[PDB]
Design a protein around this ligand. Structure first.
Ligand code: HEC
Ligand code: HEC
Ligand code: HEC
Ligand code: FE
Ligand code: FE
Lengths: 106, 106, 106
């Protein structure tokens, strides 16, 4: 899919997780987040289009999505175990990984 | 090798990082951090000595080390790039991963 | 213990998994690879015996295992969910991680 539309998925489901009531809504949104993060990993960001796909920048770009996916995974484990407050707090801490990448590459 | 000692290695090198002046020092610290986080990840913390070796808690306990080693590696990228300030800022944000795990398992 | 032996562990159980018939068998074989991979994270490969432990080659090397540990963990999840076909496929897909690292470092 699109890297913008991947980022839309991630953003929209971060807010869903914000206002969730129960565990199934959080699980639902985290599962979409993981799939979008997995598709976004293989993209070339506009600001790196001119760089070798193995430049240190594309390597660092790829690396940020591995961290994001591990964090999504860990949050989903909380949601699965029915811990809606902790799952939501993991999702909030998630935000640092988005900001860190956007600062360098958006 | 002690889990207690791996955590002092993590806490001591974190301190050296934030007090470094030159990037090679940040690099050497982070590498021992990763080696200690990686030595720690097959330990069983006090709060979980009864738990089955593959209980949900032990499972999520291992997630945190994987996330932490990734984030260290991302600072090692900044370090290797001479950028010494923002490698300290990545090490700073790192503590949120420390804290999440401490708040469940320490 | 040996790096060589971690590799025979990874290679034998990859074969075990292809020929497995049920989720338990694939989970047992994945479990074995997860330990081999975690063990090998801290090995020094013969081609890098002259690199510092904090070199960018040694950190890219350990990164390959960090990735492999993550991909094994995802496959282990599928297995644990009885999805024997998908988990077997995810074990197949691991050879990309293997090949990238052999190319650079074997
Ligand atoms: C992923 C599932 C795999 C599989 C199936 C194999 N490897 Fe590796 N490997 C790495 C290095 C540095 C070596 C050289 C070791 C040495 O010379 O002592 C190897 C070697 C092997 C072998 C042995 C081949 C031989 O002729 O001796 C085999 C069978 C093998 N590999 C299979 C490094 C890595 C990795 C670095 C991160 C990763 C990941 C893998 N290997 C993954 C796999
Ligand atoms: C590289 C790692 C990376 C990570 C990790 C990441 N982003 Fe993105 N993000 C980008 C890039 C690059 C763009 C710019 C896309 C473009 O311009 O085509 C972007 C764009 C966006 C956009 C759309 C911006 C626009 O103007 O349309 C949103 C929304 C967004 N990010 C939010 C998020 C959220 C939410 C997360 C995680 C929960 C996240 N980002 C994680 C790299 C990342
Ligand atoms: C994924 C798990 C995990 C991560 C990541 C983690 N910790 Fe620990 N930490 C623990 C546990 C469990 C203990 C309790 C060990 C004990 O009391 O035996 C602990 C204890 C500590 C202690 C007290 C040590 C002592 O002997 O009193 C300090 C300081 C510490 N952590 C700092 C850190 C730092 C610094 C980091 C990373 C930079 C970190 N922690 C990351 C699990 C973790
Ligand atoms: Fe998991
Ligand atoms: Fe790297």
């Amino acid at each position: 899919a699109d890297l913008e539309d991947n980022m839309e998925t991630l953003n929209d489901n971060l807010k869903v997780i914000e206002k969730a009531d129960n565990a199934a809504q959080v699980k639902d949104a985290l599962t979409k987040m993981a799939a979008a993060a997995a598709d976004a990993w293989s993209a070339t960001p506009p600001k790196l289009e001119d760089k070798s796909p193995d430049s240190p920048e594309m390597h660092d770009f790829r690396h940020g999505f591995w961290i994001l996916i591990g964090q999504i995974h860990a949050a989903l484990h909380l949601a699965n175990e029915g811990k809606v407050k902790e799952a939501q707090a993991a999702a909030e801490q998630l935000k640092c990984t988005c900001n860190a990448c956007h600062q360098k590459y958006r």
